[PDB]
Amino acid sequence: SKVAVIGATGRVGSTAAARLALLDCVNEVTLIARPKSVDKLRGLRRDILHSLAAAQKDAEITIGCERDDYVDADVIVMTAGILDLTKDNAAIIKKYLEGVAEENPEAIVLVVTNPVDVLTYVALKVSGLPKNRVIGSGTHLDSMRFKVLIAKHFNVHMSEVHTRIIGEHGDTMVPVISSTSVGGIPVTRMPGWEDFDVEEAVREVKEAGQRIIETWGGTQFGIAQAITNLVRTILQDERRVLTVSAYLDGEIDGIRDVCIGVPARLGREGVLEIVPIELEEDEMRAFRRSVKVVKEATREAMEAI
Amino acid sequence: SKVAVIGATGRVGSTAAARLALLDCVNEVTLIARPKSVDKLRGLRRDILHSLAAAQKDAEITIGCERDDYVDADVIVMTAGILDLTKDNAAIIKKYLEGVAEENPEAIVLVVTNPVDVLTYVALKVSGLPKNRVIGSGTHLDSMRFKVLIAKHFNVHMSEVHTRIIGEHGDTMVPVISSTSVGGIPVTRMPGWEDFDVEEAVREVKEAGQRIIETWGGTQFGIAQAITNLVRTILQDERRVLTVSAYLDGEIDGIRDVCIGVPARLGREGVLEIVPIELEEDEMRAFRRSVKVVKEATREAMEA
Amino acid sequence: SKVAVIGATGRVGSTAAARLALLDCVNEVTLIARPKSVDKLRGLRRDILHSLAAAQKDAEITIGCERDDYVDADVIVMTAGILDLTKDNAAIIKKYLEGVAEENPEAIVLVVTNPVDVLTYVALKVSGLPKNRVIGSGTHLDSMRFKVLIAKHFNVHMSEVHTRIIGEHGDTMVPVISSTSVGGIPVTRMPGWEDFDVEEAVREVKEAGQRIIETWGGTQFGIAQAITNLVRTILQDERRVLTVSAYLDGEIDGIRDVCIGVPARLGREGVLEIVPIELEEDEMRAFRRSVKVVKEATREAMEAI
Amino acid sequence: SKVAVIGATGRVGSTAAARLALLDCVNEVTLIARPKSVDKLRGLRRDILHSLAAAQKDAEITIGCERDDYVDADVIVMTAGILDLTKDNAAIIKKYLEGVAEENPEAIVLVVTNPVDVLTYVALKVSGLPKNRVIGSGTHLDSMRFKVLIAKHFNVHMSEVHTRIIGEHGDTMVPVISSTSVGGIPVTRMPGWEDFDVEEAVREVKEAGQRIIETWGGTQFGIAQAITNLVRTILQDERRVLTVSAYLDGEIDGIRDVCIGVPARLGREGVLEIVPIELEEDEMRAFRRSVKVVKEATREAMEA
C-alpha cells in the first residue's frame, strides 16, 4: 500500500507522514511538495527513516513534486494549504486532484485542509472519483475527544463509550446524544448523566482549535493521529463506524448534495455507506442549520473554482 | 501480581494458566492441585515455561497443594470441579476458599466451576471476602459471543457492538436488546435488525457448551481466554463494564441475595459497581425467572 | 492465508490451531483429522471460535478429512502421530503428503511429529515439494529455551541474546557457543560467562521433553507457540535466522542429504538459505556425530516406506 | 511514572513529549519551558491530549516553568538548547539541573542537547546525582541506524543484527565491528560482509544530521523516538544493552572521568553497568582519539 501526503512540508503533513510510516499496513509513504520545497522533503525523509530505525519499523519513503509521483497511490492525503483563503486552498485542491480518476479510479482521497467539509466537496468534484472514495477528516477527532470527555465523567474504559459529533467541523457542529451509549446503555439512562454538561463539553471541543492556533501555532499531533486512524481503518478494511466529512445523498433527512461530518462504515473501498442515523427534533434542526452553512460556503468556493 | 489457578491439572485450568502467564500484568502464576497431582504440575510448569520462551515473555511459575501456596495471591482462579454435582463442587469451594479473607482480605476470587452463579455465591459466603472481590465467569463469554454474531450480521468492526446476556449461565439466560448498540445507535434503529433472528442466536449461545462436551469433551480455549480477559481487566484497572457473576444488592429491580450475571464496572478493586441497568417488560420477566432458578439452586448447595 | 493442521484432535494440534487462529496473518485455519474423528473437530472448532470472540480476533475455521480439504493450504502443519513408531508415523506422513506438489507446488510443510528430523526428510521425499518448502520444528524451541537461560544468567533483556542448538532434536543436539552473542558481544568475552555451566543448561534442554512426558503427558503449549512463531515468520516474510530441521546440501562442512536442525533465513518462500555457519573443532565433531544418528534413522525410516 | 521534558516548546521537545505520552509506562508528562513561553505550552498540551484521544491512550499532561514543577519527576528529559554554543547550553544545564539530587535523589536525567556527551558531564556534575542516573542520547540513534544498514545488506530481520557505534556523537564516532553479530554469528564470518562498505555507512550516519539541518531545519522524529525508546527501557526495567552517553570509570581500557557513548545495561535504576567491551587495535585507537576530543571540549564547558 502506498500513501501519498501532499503538503508534507507543513506541520500536519510532516507529522502525519511520520506516524503513517509506523503503520504495518503502510509499506510506502510518498512526500509531495511544491518543486521549490522538495529539498526540504529530503531532510524530512531522512528524519522519518531515523524514526523507523528507532522504532524498529520499516517503510519506503519516496519524494516528488509532480502528478506521476502520487497519482498511483492507494490513499492521497491533502494537507497542503494556508473567504479568500477558502479560495486559494480550493485552487490548490484543484491543481493537485483534477482528473485523478482518469489515471487511478481506485484512489482514495482524505482532505484535511480547512474548511474541510467544503474542500472535500471540491476534491470530489474536480477529482472525478466515486463519492465513496473521497472524504475529509471532518468531525472525527472532535468525536473522539467528546468520547474521552464522557468516558472520564463516568470513569469507564474509553472503549465503552460510543458517541459522535456530526455536521460542520466548526461552530455548527451537533452532538448526537440520541446515538450515544456507555457499554451499550443509552447515556441518558446512565447514572450521573445529569451531572454532565454537554454544552461546556461541546464548547471545549469547538474552541480548542482556535486556542491552539493562538498559542502553539496550530494542531499537529492531534490531527496527525486522526489521519493515521482513518488510513489504518481503510487499508485494513476494519469497517468501523467513523464520523467523517462525506457526500450526503439522502441517507439522513433526505439531505443531499453536500459533504459534511456524518457516520460512515469505512473499509478498503472507502465509504461503504452513510449510516442512516435518526435524529431527534433539536438534533435535526441543528443538523439542518449546519448543512445550510456548509452548502453556502461550498457554493462560494465553487464559484471561485 | 500473582495469580493462582486452582484446578490447573484440568483442561480449563492448564490452558488458563498458560494464557495468563503471557500477560504482561501477570508476573507469577501458581499452579494448585491435589497433593497426589503435584508431579503432573511439574510438567505443566515446564511446558508453560517453554511457551513463554517461544513467545519471548517471562513469568515466575510456582506449584503447590496447600493453602499457604495461594492465599496471598492477588487473584485466585477457581477451576477445580468434578445437584449431586453442585454439592461436591461446593464442598471443593469450601475446602479451598474457607477463611481466605482472614489471611488475605484484599484477595479477588474468580469462580469458573459450574454452576458458576451458584458456586460464586458459595465462594463469597465461605470466603468472608467483600462482595466486590468475588465474581464468576458467568455470562461473560456468552456476551462476547453474542457481540460477534451481531457484528457479523451488520458487517461492522466488533468493537462497534456493545451488547449483553445477563442472568444465569445456562438455559434461563436473557439477552438485553434494550442495552445493545452499534456505534452508539440503538440496535433496534440500525438498518437490517429485522433480518437478525435473536432467538436462534440465543440458542446457538446456550447450546454450544453441550455440543462441545459431546464432541471435544468440554470447552477449553474459549473459557481460558475469557479468564485471561477478566484478570487483565482487574490487574490493569481498566474499568470496563463486563458481565460477570456477582452479588446483587438491589441494583436491578431491587433484587437481592443472589450471585448472577450482571453488568459490572471492573477494576483492580474488583466490582466497582453493578450498573443499574433498566430492563423492559419482557427482559425483566425473563431475568426474574432466572433469578428464581439460581436462588433455588443456591439454597440447596448451601444446605449441603 | 490458509494454514492446515493435520492431527488437530491431539494435544499439539489442538493448541497449535487455537494459537494460530489468533495471528493476524492467518485468515483461515483448517482442522484435519481421520474421518472417524471429524465430529471431535466440530467441538474444537466451536471452542476456538469462542476463544477468538474473547480475544476480539477473527479467523475462518474449517474442518475436513480428505486431501481436497488441506492441499490448497499455504502452510500444512503435521502433528498427527503416536523404531516401529517411527515406522507408523512415517506411514502417516506418506498417506497425507504424497504427491502434494502436483496439486499445490507452492505448499509449505512444517513437520512436528517425532522423530522430527527423520520425518521432515520423509515429508520432503514423498511430497515432491522443493527442498525450501518442507521443514520441521527441530531445535527451534530448544534454541529459544537456551536463549532464555543465558539471558537470565547475564540478567539482560532476552532480545539481546542470540544463540542456537543445532543437530538432532534429541540426545545428539549441539550448542553453538561459537555463534552465541550478548548484545553482539561474543558470549565467551562477556563478564560472568565462566559462571555459566553450558553442560547443565543443555541437559535441562535435552531431558525436559521426557520429564514432561512422564508427568503432564507431553509437550503442548511450548510446541504450539513454537509452531505459531514459525508460521508467523513465514507468512509475514520476516526473514529471521531460525533454527529448524531442513535439508542440508553442503552448506555446513559439505554435509549433504539429511534433514537436521540448522540456522535458516526464513520467509514467505520457506527456507531462503541455510546460513553457512563455521563450527569449531568440538562443535563440528558433535555435529558430525549428530548427522550420523539422523541419517541412519532416516534410512531405516525410508526402508519402511 | 512522571516524565518531564525541558525544552518542550522546541522541535525535539514537543515531538518527544507527544510520543512519550503514548507510552503505557508514562502516566504523566510535564512540559517545561521559560516563563514567557507558558501559553505556547498550553496549546501543545491540548494538541497532545487530542493525539491521546485519537490513539485511545491516556496521560496527565502538566505544564510549568519552575523547578518545583519538574524536580520530583522520575525522568527529566533535557532538550533545552540555543564553543560559544556549548557554553550557553551548559549554562542552561546548570540553571535547570543544579542541586536536583538534594530534592530528588532518585531522579534520572536524559540529556539530548548537543554537544550531548559534554553536556551529559555538565549535567552529572551540577546535578549531584549518582553517575548511574545521568545519561545522554549519545550514539543510541547512530547505533540503531547502523543496525538497519547492516540488516538491509544481509536482508535479515532487523532484530537479528546487534551492532554498536561508540564514542562521540559526532565526527570521531567509532563503529565496533568486533562486537557486531547477525544471529549470533560474528559479522566478519557472515557471507557477503566483503560487499559492505563500512566507511561509507559511517559517513552516512555521521553526516545525515548536517543534511537534515540544511534541509528540514533539524532532526525531530528520529531523536524523539530514540528518547521514547530510552525512557521505556528505563521505566519498564527491560535491561537492554543500549549505547548512551554515560560516565566512564575504567570499564573500557581504564578510561575515566568522561561521559561518552558506551554500551550500558539500562534499567529502572539507570546505568546498571557499562559493559566492559573489549576493542581491537584500530577500534581502540579511534575510541581513544574520540575520548580526547570529548574530554577537551568538556573542560572548556566546565571552565565557563
Ligand SMILES: NC(=O)C1=CN([C@@H]2O[C@H](COP(=O)(O)OP(=O)(O)OC[C@H]3O[C@@H](n4cnc5c(N)ncnc54)[C@H](OP(=O)(O)O)[C@@H]3O)[C@@H](O)[C@H]2O)C=CC1
Ligand atoms: N481538523 C482539521 O481539519 C485541521 C485542519 N488543518 C489544515 O491543514 C492545512 C495545513 O496546516 P499546517 O500544516 O499547519 O500549515 P503549514 O503552514 O505548517 O503547512 C502548509 C502546507 O501547505 C503547503 N502550501 C501552502 N500554500 C501552497 C500552495 N499555494 N501550493 C502548494 N502547496 C502549498 C506548504 O508548502 P510550502 O512549505 O511550500 O509553503 C505546506 O506543505 C491548513 O489548511 C489547515 O487549516 C490543520 C490541522 C487540523
Ligand SMILES: NC(=O)C1=CN([C@@H]2O[C@H](COP(=O)(O)OP(=O)(O)OC[C@H]3O[C@@H](n4cnc5c(N)ncnc54)[C@H](OP(=O)(O)O)[C@@H]3O)[C@@H](O)[C@H]2O)C=CC1
Ligand atoms: N463457567 C464456565 O464457563 C465453564 C465451567 N467449567 C467448569 O470447570 C470445571 C473444570 O472443568 P475441566 O477442567 O474440563 O475438568 P477436568 O476434569 O479436566 O479438570 C478438573 C479439575 O478439578 C480437579 N478436581 C477434580 N475433583 C477434585 C476434587 N475432589 N478436589 C479437588 N480438585 C478436584 C482436577 O484435579 P485432579 O486431576 O487432581 O482430579 C482438575 O484440576 C468443571 O466444574 C466445569 O463445569 C468448564 C468450562 C467452562
Ligand SMILES: NC(=O)C1=CN([C@@H]2O[C@H](COP(=O)(O)OP(=O)(O)OC[C@H]3O[C@@H](n4cnc5c(N)ncnc54)[C@H](OP(=O)(O)O)[C@@H]3O)[C@@H](O)[C@H]2O)C=CC1
Ligand atoms: N518438539 C517436538 O518435535 C514435539 C513433537 N511432538 C509430536 O507430535 C505428535 C503428536 O503428539 P500429541 O498431539 O501429544 O499426541 P496425541 O495422542 O495427543 O494426538 C495424536 C494425533 O495424531 C493423530 N493420529 C494418531 N495416529 C494416527 C493415524 N494412524 N492416522 C491418522 N492420524 C493419527 C490423532 O488422531 P486420533 O485422535 O484420531 O487418534 C491425533 O490428532 C507426536 O508424534 C509427538 O512426538 C509433540 C510435541 C513436541
Ligand SMILES: NC(=O)C1=CN([C@@H]2O[C@H](COP(=O)(O)OP(=O)(O)OC[C@H]3O[C@@H](n4cnc5c(N)ncnc54)[C@H](OP(=O)(O)O)[C@@H]3O)[C@@H](O)[C@H]2O)C=CC1
Ligand atoms: N543529541 C541529539 O541527537 C540531538 C540534539 N539536539 C539538540 O536539542 C536542542 C534543541 O533542538 P531544537 O528543539 O531543534 O531547537 P529549538 O530552537 O526548536 O528548541 C529549543 C528549545 O530550547 C529552549 N531554549 C532556547 N534557549 C533557551 C534558554 N536560553 N533558556 C532556556 N530554554 C531555552 C526553547 O524555548 P524557547 O521557545 O523559550 O526559546 C526551546 O524549547 C539543541 O541543542 C540541539 O542541538 C537536537 C536534535 C538531536
Ligand SMILES: [Cl-]
Ligand atoms: Cl510525531
Ligand SMILES: [Cl-]
Ligand atoms: Cl468518530
Ligand SMILES: [Cl-]
Ligand atoms: Cl461482557
Ligand SMILES: [Cl-]
Ligand atoms: Cl492455548
Ligand SMILES: [Cl-]
Ligand atoms: Cl532458533
Ligand SMILES: [Cl-]
Ligand atoms: Cl544502541
Ligand SMILES: [K+]
Ligand atoms: K510501515
Ligand SMILES: [K+]
Ligand atoms: K507475564
Ligand SMILES: [K+]
Ligand atoms: K486471525
Ligand SMILES: [K+]
Ligand atoms: K500514557
